[PDB]
Amino acid sequence: PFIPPPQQTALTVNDHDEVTVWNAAPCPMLPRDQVYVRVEAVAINPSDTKMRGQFATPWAFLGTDYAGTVVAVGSDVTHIQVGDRVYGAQNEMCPRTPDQGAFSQYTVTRGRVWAKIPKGLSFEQAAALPAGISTAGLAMKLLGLPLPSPSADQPPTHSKPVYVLVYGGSTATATVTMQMLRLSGYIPIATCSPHNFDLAKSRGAEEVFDYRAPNLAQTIRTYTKNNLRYALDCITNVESTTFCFAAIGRAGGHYVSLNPFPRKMVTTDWTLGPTIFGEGSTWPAPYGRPGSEEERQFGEDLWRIAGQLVEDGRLVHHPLRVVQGGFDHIKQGMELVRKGELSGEKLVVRLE
Numbered sequence: 001p002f003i004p005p006p007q008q009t010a011l012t013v014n015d016h017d018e019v020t021v022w023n024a025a026p027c028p029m030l031p032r033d034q035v036y037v038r039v040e041a042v043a044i045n046p047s048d049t050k051m052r053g054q055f056a057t058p059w060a061f062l063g064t065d066y067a068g069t070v071v072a073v074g075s076d077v078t079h080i081q082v083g084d085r086v087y088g089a090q091n092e093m094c095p096r097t098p099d100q101g102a103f104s105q106y107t108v109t110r111g112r113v114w115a116k117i118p119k120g121l122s123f124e125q126a127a128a129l130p131a132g133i134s135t136a137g138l139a140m141k142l143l144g145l146p147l148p149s150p151s152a153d154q155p156p157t158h159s160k161p162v163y164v165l166v167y168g169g170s171t172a173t174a175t176v177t178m179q180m181l182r183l184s185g186y187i188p189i190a191t192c193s194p195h196n197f198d199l200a201k202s203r204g205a206e207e208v209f210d211y212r213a214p215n216l217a218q219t220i221r222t223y224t225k226n227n228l229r230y231a232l233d234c235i236t237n238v239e240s241t242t243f244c245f246a247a248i249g250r251a252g253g254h255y256v257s258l259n260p261f262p263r264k265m266v267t268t269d270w271t272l273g274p275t276i277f278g279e280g281s282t283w284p285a286p287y288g289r290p291g292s293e294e295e296r297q298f299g300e301d302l303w304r305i306a307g308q309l310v311e312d313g314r315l316v317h318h319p320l321r322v323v324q325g326g327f328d329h330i331k332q333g334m335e336l337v338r339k340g341e342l343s344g345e346k347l348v349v350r351l352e
């Protein structure tokens with residue numbers, strides 16, 4: 001049986017709320033239904049930068065998005081060989097599993113929220129995808145929109161065009177969501193900054209608008225025949241919620257946000273990330289919820305679908321900004337992300 005290394009490097013937060021390169025971190029045990037991954041590349045997400053204060057578990061590993069090489073295979077796992085390449089998501093800073101996080105030299109795969117990297121994709125391209133895939137699926141689920149068929153030789157047809165507003169169409173989440181929406185037969189319309197217009201259109205937006213434009217909500221209401229029933233808010237602040245409520249049609253609509261938030265006929269939801277694992281959250285406030293087998297199966301189904309889409313080139317990664325380096329480079333990348341210094345790109349670290 002496989003024996004994990006006695007120590008490794010991982011990124012964590014210490015007992016003084018500081019992001020820390022930890023050079024004596026433990027290695028996880030190998031679950032019988034998972035595989036053991038030597039991490040080759042990771043992506044940085046805003047969620048990583050927010051794991052602080054009450055949100056941090058000291059000495060628990062940071063990071064969601066990883067891609068690496070399989071070094072050991074759990075005894076109950078089929079269809080994966082030692083030396084295969086995989087990509088997937090981890091559930092960062094879960095006090096029950098503090099030795100599992102993407103920002104580590106060695107991790108294990110989690111649930112079935114992972115896949116084999118297609119032959120034509122690099123570690124960096126693959127690492128850019130997992131939180132995107134996962135978030136896009138949770139949002140479509142919450143909006144009440146069906147997932148794409150991995151078959152189906154092309155999108156369902158609708159009665160009339162069914163628009164979906166995506167506020168923040170240059171975000172990492174939006175560029176993956178808009179491809180998926182299109183594959184399901186929906187027509188995304190996006191708002192973002194002018195320099196990311198071409199990116200939004202390349203990723204499935206039928207039209208794209210500058211979110212700063214005066215009375216843009218009237219423009220959108222006109223465009224959608226005053227019957228916009230779906231708004232996906234990828235920005236999630238006071239202004240984006242106001243805009244989305246204004247753009248939704250006179251007969252009502254559904255607003256889904258990627259974070260919690262503090263007129264009639266609008267239902268509202270927001271995506272809780274660990275939900276993709278069928279895990280819940282131990283956090284208090286609006287976060288804590290029990291896990292569920294239905295949530296687990298959804299996540300597996302999504303990943304089976306999206307895996308095939310990525311494999312056939314029908315779902316593509318957000319543009320990359322690739323850094324070569326070690327764990328301090330992940331730490332610096334987080335700060336860049338936290339400061340909003342990235343536009344239209346995802347920061348990926350290839351671990352050297």
Ligand SMILES: C/C=C/C(=O)SCCNC(=O)CCNC(=O)[C@H](O)C(C)(C)COP(=O)(O)OP(=O)(O)OC[C@H]1O[C@@H](n2cnc3c(N)ncnc32)[C@H](OP(=O)(O)O)[C@@H]1O
Nearest residue numbers: 046047089134135170171172173192193196258273343344
């Ligand atoms: C395995 C994990 C699975 C999950 O489901 S995680 C669940 C989803 N939720 C969260 O992770 C919560 C924590 N995350 C956040 O709060 C993120 O910031 C969200 C999820 C809201 C967005 O992250 P994402 O990675 O999708 O976007 P990004 O960082 O790539 O987007 C940045 C872009 O956001 C845009 N932006 C930034 N501030 C903006 C503003 N005030 N107004 C309008 N747009 C704004 C601005 O775009 P341009 O205007 O075109 O340059 C900027 O480039």
